[PDB]
Homo-oligomer: A and B are copies of this chain.
């Protein structure tokens, strides 16, 4: 196997994820089978106990693992289905080693960071890079992305491990790409290279020497800075890639190919890539990158969320909307409406903000009510669901907009002003949402309905089933404990509601619809985790279509 470690320099948040995914899609278009690994140096087995403000929209994999979002970038660019062992952390490693020790598999000897922790890291990487990730095909390249910045005390074990790995795997089977920042202050008005110099120096002071140096700047830099970097880093003048701020991220693979990275790698790792046939493989990505510039229609969508102060806490949602729009040939424009500012409590505090946010919500072509955990800001979601039900405005809810929509329907058509979940107020008289742990009721192994599960379609013509291709069932990724109450099923179904999707046991409804409303679908699963750039999720696709008044035409 051949490995490509990707490291970071001046700051964290400079683009290693897209760089790595681009290497991956390049190598995958040239006929290879790539896999990927993300190394988070934080002491956390997984991202289940995380808040979106911390690390941006916890992802979910098919086996039920909750991981970083960079694995989402990998899955969306390479079109693969990773596993849990593709997300290494310091906690996983130390816990594995400590268990091994207490058991007695290090019999009699002293366990130290070097060599035992680093051997664990190496064995992990080697074992994981051989797990068939796109069926049964065995990988040939593995892209490791070392989160953080080179120099921190958190990621020294890993740097040492890879310092030994390059000797262990015959450097002709190992490359290292360093992503650094070239700041261009507004005072000096000149790009500065000293940060990159210090970062490369710190790196080489750890036993590693870069082969590529991808310099991330806001605006393009000239050959002067390129040759300065080449000199002060002993890299050539053609293996210093310059990646400025592009329109979209489908430009990055192209900006890398045009800079001769495919040829460099084919010559450096000895991959045996037939050049004459590696033409016209990125055609799909060129088309997609052109459609990113050749769309002027201005479809506007409303994201009624509670973390809207961050734009990374909805990464997969935003990106699925973008994919669907690009497939509909429209220019998406997203307004981030905070659900806290739709309640009357802010009307008593800042009527200005209240009316401004409600105006935003009212002059939009569609409404998306994402998921979330807790209680802060759910009443606003219910207000928005109601307003979109009383104004014939399309709406899509995801695992919490479904609960909110059902609550709205209850408290506004059954008059049950006490309708609520068992989460916001447990001692409520009427409870439309109650816990249904998958199997935690009985054991501790399996509390939350995590991972990919089956959902069959109840009989009845439904637009959501038509969008999905009129199948019998779908596999989708779930992350939720609660569920719609099975007793109020008829109390709310003898009305403008319809449950078209459920599990094989018919006790869990996870796809609802409204009668007469043009588009009021809501799902208990997360359809955004299976939305690839060349494959938009049917729900978001229908949302966009109905939001521009083209859905019925698209069906017929």
A residues bordering B, Cβ < 8 Å? Answer: 10-15, 41-45, 49-51, 54-55, 90-91, 94-95, 97-98, 101-102, 104, 106-117, 149, 151, 153-154, 156-157, 160, 164, 167, 181, 183, 185-188, 190, 192, 194-195, 198, 201-202, 204-207, 218, 231, 234, 245
Contact = CB atoms under 8 A, between A and B. Distances in A.
Number of chain copies forming the complex:
3
B204 A112 contact: no
B55 A110 contact: yes
Contact of A207 (B116, B164, B204): B204
A43 B116 contact: yes
Contacts of A194: 10-12, 149
Contact of A198 (B42, B90, B151, B245): B151
Contacts of A198: 149, 151, 198, 202
Given A42-B112, A43-B98, A43-B116, 6 more contacts: A11-B194, A49-B101, A49-B102, A51-B108, A91-B94, A149-B198
A45 B101 contact: yes
Given A101-B49, A198-B198, A204-B207, A111 B13 contact: no
Contacts of A94: 43, 91, 94-95, 98
B157 A192 contact: no
Contact of A154 (B95, B107, B112, B154): B112
Contacts of A13: 185, 187-188, 190, 192
A402 B50 CA distance: 58
Contact of A44 (B45, B111, B115, B187): B111
22 contacts: A11-B194, A12-B194, A13-B185, A42-B111, A43-B101, A45-B98, A49-B106, A49-B107, A49-B108, A50-B108, A54-B110, A55-B110, A91-B94, A91-B111, A95-B95, A114-B154, A151-B198, A153-B160, A167-B234, A183-B183, A195-B195, A205-B205
Quick one: which of A113, A151, A188 has the most chain B CB within 10 A? A113
Contacts of A10: 10, 183, 194-195
Nearest to A153: B113
Contacts of A183: 10-11, 181, 183
Contacts of A185: 11, 13-14, 181, 218
Residue of A49, A55, A188 with most partner-chain B CB within 10 A: A49
A108 B207 CA distance: 35
A183 B186 CA distance: 11
Contacts of A190: 13
A16 to B, nearest CB: 12
